[PDB]
Structure formats: structure tokens, C-alpha cells
């Protein structure tokens, strides 16, 4: 079932009647997956299929959640240097990202996300490329320096 909303999920930029489905390239060498080019699914905020251009930062993360609809959480784990102790310390930050159903992403999977406009109250990113990866504890606890 494609049309799940009260409205008709169309795909802006499609052009149905005249001409010789719509996707774009997004750039920075991130290959548009098969599932975007083939495989109907409408998404306003897909990098490839929709109308959001990714631009600004690109940062790899590691997914913590799939619980939201078409939306993912990724903790960036990183090292904050403290000059007093000339040592580091694990620190982190949970970036919420928009997904788009071209990417089937279970937790612990590495992703890379480009920036893009403010899509919601907190989701300013969308996932461009999903490496696979496997995890055994909780993704919560995996440090992957990156």
C-alpha cells in the first residue's frame, strides 16, 4: 500500500501526463540506490526521490533507533580533548536524521548523513549512504571513533 495518508501521496517533480518516476543524484559521490530509481514510495524529504538538496556538513554516525516513521537516530561518538589532563574523553551526540525507505536500516548500522534544510523540530539531516555493520551489545554503548 503506497497511498496511506488522508491525502494522495503524489511525488512532486514527477510529470505524469506529458514527457519522454522522479529521482535525482544528490552529489558528493553518493550513489542513488536501486530502491529509489526503481520501487515506488513517495517521500517529500528523501534526498534522492524528494525535493531536499543535501548541502553543508556530511557526518557518519551509527543508528540507535528505527522507531520513528522514516526517521532514524544516530549517535556520533567522538573524543573531546581536555588540555589540562592532555587526555581525551569519549563524548557523544544524537543526531536525528530523516531516512527515506530506500534504506532498510536496522540498529547499529553505520550511516552517513548530509545536512539539508530543517525538516522538523530537530531533524536537519538525511541519510545518504548506509553501510551495513553488525552490533552485539546495544548501539547505545558501541563507541566507533569515526
Amino acid at each position: 500500500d503506497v497511498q496511506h495518508e488522508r491525502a494522495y501521496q503524489k511525488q512532486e517533480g514527477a510529470s505524469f501526463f506529458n514527457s519522454k518516476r522522479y529521482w535525482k543524484k544528490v552529489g558528493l559521490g553518493f550513489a542513488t540506490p536501486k530502491e529509489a530509481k526503481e520501487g515506488v514510495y513517495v517521500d517529500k524529504k528523501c534526498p534522492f526521490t524528494g525535493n531536499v538538496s543535501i548541502r553543508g556538513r556530511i557526518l557518519k554516525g551509527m543508528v540507535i533507533s528505527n522507531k520513528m516513521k522514516r526517521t532514524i537516530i544516530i549517535r556520533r561518538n567522538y573524543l573531546h580533548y581536555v588540555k589540562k589532563y592532555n587526555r581525551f574523553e569519549k563524548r557523544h551526540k544524537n543526531i536525528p536524521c530523516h531516512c527515506s525507505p530506500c534504506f532498510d536500516v536496522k540498529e547499529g548500522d553505520i550511516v552517513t548523513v548530509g545536512q539539508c534544510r530543517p525538516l522538523s523540530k530537530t531533524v536537519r539531516f538525511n541519510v545518504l549512504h548506509v553501510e551495513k555493520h553488525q552490533i552485539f551489545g546495544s548501539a547505545r554503548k558501541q563507541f566507533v571513533l569515526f
Binding site: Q3, E5, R6, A7, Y8, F16, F17, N18, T122
Partner: protein, 172 residues
């Protein structure tokens, strides 16, 4: 009013330290209706006027298959994926499905070739044809009348049309 005054995602109260800066303007909704035309001008930022349609009728409606358009009175609102209240109140917004007085399109067709620039070959749907037979056809609105001040829209077609019919479906 476009601004903060809102919890912090962790659910912590943002203790506010800033009034309301005018560029965070949230001026109130024009619930634009049917009727004889009547539109006010609101003065947005750099003298950028925008046209609060408050009553409307004679929007520009397109026929996508043939890629043409005509100005018609719009005779009723019949669905609103936002909420049914709006449709009850007969309020036009940017994805309202409404009914056009659809004689104009028919007339155009007659003028061009047959009876119910030219890449004709498509030659109409069954459902659409049926609709035309009663005079009055379902059509999305596509302008945001509250901003733009026009009820510009387009005729609903094939799959989308079917879906909307299903949604409408009566039944009990």
C-alpha cells in the same frame, strides 16, 4: 510566534530571554471561503505585499492531460486531508478537492475536436467523462489562496481521482 517558547527535545524548559522580534511574525489565518471575491492586502516584510483572499470563487483551473487552463466559479468543497471542519465551513486551501463548474473545459474540447498545442491522442478518462456529463468536476486547489489570493487549481486525474472518490465513499 514563529519562535522558541517550546521544550528543548530533552523536555527541558527553555527559560526565555528575548521578547518577540517582529521578524518572528505569526499573523493569523485567513480562513478563505466561497462567495463573491474579496481580498485584503497584508504588508509582509520588505513591503512584500501578499493577498489574503478571504472569499473566492473564480479560480484558474487547469486540465493537466491537455495542459490547459480556464477560469471557473467553484461550486463546492468536498474533501480536506487536513480536517473535515474546513470542508464543513467551505474553506479553500492548497490541497482542497473542490467541484468546478466544468462547462468551460467541455466547451474548449468542442471547439478543438469533437464533443466530449494539440498532442491529442490521450482522449479522456471514463470517470472524468461521466463527471463532465453532470457539468461539475472534482479538482484540487494548488495555490495557497491565503497567501497568493487566487484559488488556482487543477483537475484531478485517473489514479488520484479514483483515490479521492474512494475517500469520499457515502457507504454509511
Amino acid at each position: 510566534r514563529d519562535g522558541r517558547h517550546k521544550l528543548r527535545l530533552t523536555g527541558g524548559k527553555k527559560k526565555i530571554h528575548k521578547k518577540k522580534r517582529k521578524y518572528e511574525l505569526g499573523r493569523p489565518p485567513s480562513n478563505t471561503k466561497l462567495g463573491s471575491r474579496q481580498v485584503h492586502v497584508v504588508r509582509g516584510r520588505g513591503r512584500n505585499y501578499k493577498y489574503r483572499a478571504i472569499k473566492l470563487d473564480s479560480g484558474s483551473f487547469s486540465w493537466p492531460t491537455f495542459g490547459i487552463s480556464k477560469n471557473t466559479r467553484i461550486i463546492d468543497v468536498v474533501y480536506n486531508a487536513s480536517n473535515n471542519e474546513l470542508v464543513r465551513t467551505k474553506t479553500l486551501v492548497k490541497n482542497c478537492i473542490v467541484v468546478i463548474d466544468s462547462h468551460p473545459f467541455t466547451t474548449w474540447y468542442e471547439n478543438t475536436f469533437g464533443t466530449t498545442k494539440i498532442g491529442k491522442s490521450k482522449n479522456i478518462d471514463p470517470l472524468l467523462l461521466e463527471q463532465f456529463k453532470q457539468g461539475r468536476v472534482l479538482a484540487c486547489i494548488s495555490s495557497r489562496p491565503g497567501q497568493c489570493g487566487k484559488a488556482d487549481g487543477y483537475i484531478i486525474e485517473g489514479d488520484e481521482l479514483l483515490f479521492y472518490k474512494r475517500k469520499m465513499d457515502k457507504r454509511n
